[model samples]
Target: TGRPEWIWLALGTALMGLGTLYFLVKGMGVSDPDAKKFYAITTLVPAIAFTMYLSMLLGYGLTMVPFGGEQNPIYWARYADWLFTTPLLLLDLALLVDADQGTILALVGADGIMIGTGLVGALTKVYSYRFVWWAISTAAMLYILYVLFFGFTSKAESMRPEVASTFKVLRNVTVVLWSAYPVVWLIGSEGAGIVPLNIETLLFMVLDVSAKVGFGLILLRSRAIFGEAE
Candidate 1:
């Protein structure tokens, strides 16, 4: 009926919206696999989301930074800039939070249309195992959301030194792991001098598609138990 790009993008947008709503109903679930994979994915989300989020960032930054008169059309566009940019920063914060409670909840409901795509993928063919994959991948997403939230959000100053001191070990190690996780991509890209079609760029896209699509496959196989095996 239409071009592939238009169809796929439209579908992607719609599915994300529905999945987001379902995420809200789930009490902001979290996954604690204690695997490096979890940490890697957790680290990856912020870097990727933020990098892509920068279009809005630049728009707002330029508009707010004083590119011209406030009365002019360009200046007023900053309002539009703010309208779009603020939520992105908020989502960034929600995803970045160290507390699972805050981060997971925020991820699910923050945007209905975007998140709903999880729901859409399940219903379609070639992705026939729809519901199952959605549930699993989404579950994994929820878990990763928790890990990233904890990985980034909580503050040491929020608690007492004695109790907080315990986190010192976890913090010292986990922080480095999480921080280093994303940096390695940067390091690999820079040091390789090979550039373009670069390892880091590929790694990011591969894992992302794998994680999302992989979960879909898993869900397709076991939809009965996950959400809808029918």
Candidate 2:
């Protein structure tokens, strides 16, 4: 039903889910409440998303729907996966920053829009209109980055020194890690034949590992810093 490339993607995503589950169970074994919350937010949520995403990837291949326009892969399943996973990731960041309720909600809303627009862009039959949705998605991504970098950074500075330092480091790393998504999207999906489908699968697979699995490890290790009572 799909491409060979997605077999690797399915496996990679499954690994991410397993890794997250391991930490989630470990966190449950601990007696600390904050540690539990950390696992719930960073590991459990991601694990669930990764599991669902893997299922979708395995079932749907690299592309889902076949439209009349370009033969480009329309990863509707991936976009649906991102709709949940991406916001969960941002919510974890928001928790670290102790972001206000309003800001956190706004951040999640923006991420949802980004994912939604990207899906629309991928599904769009018209080339010109597809680009429009892509541009809108990019704008949404920029807003998310802006809030995390500028808005969250400013709030982090007001926290305890240790927390502030860790927040800055994690936040900066997250920014760098996340910035790659749009680049990959531009190269693989949105761009005009810049990269091949197999290559795009490889690139996204690496990114998925780094962003989800690696990021989870970092967060789990940061329990000492993030678990403090506010």
Candidate 3:
């Protein structure tokens, strides 16, 4: 029932959506320096983990690489990264499901738009269609639901474990992405400093949820709104 176009569109939509969320979150407020430092480390942790995973996937499991000379099963700094990103590969897979050629372009363009306008809004005390950004985010969220419920559900019914596994991995990755950030932020705070969990969680969640739902609404309205214009 699915094909390359679907995969492409989905993946494009996911990336676009991810970019949108990043814009809205960063746009909404500044991270405390302490929180920021932790976020940075958290980001780096996953980067290294991704490197390791890439190595393993490209080659064999744990071949050639040395972790602290003895290849221990773990390390604290590395653990954070691995845990978060391992599932995140699914987000990429989710994007790969989209069929729209302009999907990637839309994401890139939207990223630029978000960056430029978001900056203006932040610096000049403006709050306009920043909500619209959220609207786009909602569109992406909808796409994810479609993939999981329709594409993935169908794949599961077809009894393709490997294929289903891929979707499942992505589903989990999406969950981890949203869930891990706050935890990582808190952990980072513990190490670099501390902040009220409620405050940090609430602020980020507001932006995240807004972006998701906002994007969904915008996409839904676009056809009716724009179709009438033409």
lDDT of 3 by residue, 59-176 (tens): 3222222222332211122223223432233233333243243443443343344334322222221223334443443344445444445553333454434434543544554554
Candidate 1 per-residue C-alpha lDDT over 1-230 given as tens digits, one digit per residue, 9 for 90 to 100: 13222333233333333333433333234333322223333233333333332332233312221111221111122123223332343333332223455554554343332234332432234323444444444454444435433544355345444334333333343333323323332233222223332344344333333333232223222212121112
Q: Write the per-residue lDDT of candidate 2 for residues 128-180, one digit (tens) a residue.
A: 67678878988998998888777764575467665565566667777887788
- Write down the RMSD of candidate 3 (Cα, Å): 21.0
TM-score list, all predictions: 0.24, 0.87, 0.29
Error of 3 at 14 (Å): 26
**Candidate 1, which segments miss by more than 4 Å at Cα?**
1-103, 106-184, 188-197, 224-230
For model 3, the local distance difference test gives: 0.34
lDDT of 1: 0.33
Among the numbered candidates, top lDDT falls to: 2
Looking at candidate 1, the ten consecutive residues that score lowest on lDDT are 66-75
On lDDT, who's better, 2 or 3? 2
How large is the C-alpha RMSD of every model relative to the true structure?
17.9, 2.6, 21.0
Alpha carbon lDDT of each predicted model: 0.33, 0.72, 0.34
Candidate number with greatest TM-score: 2
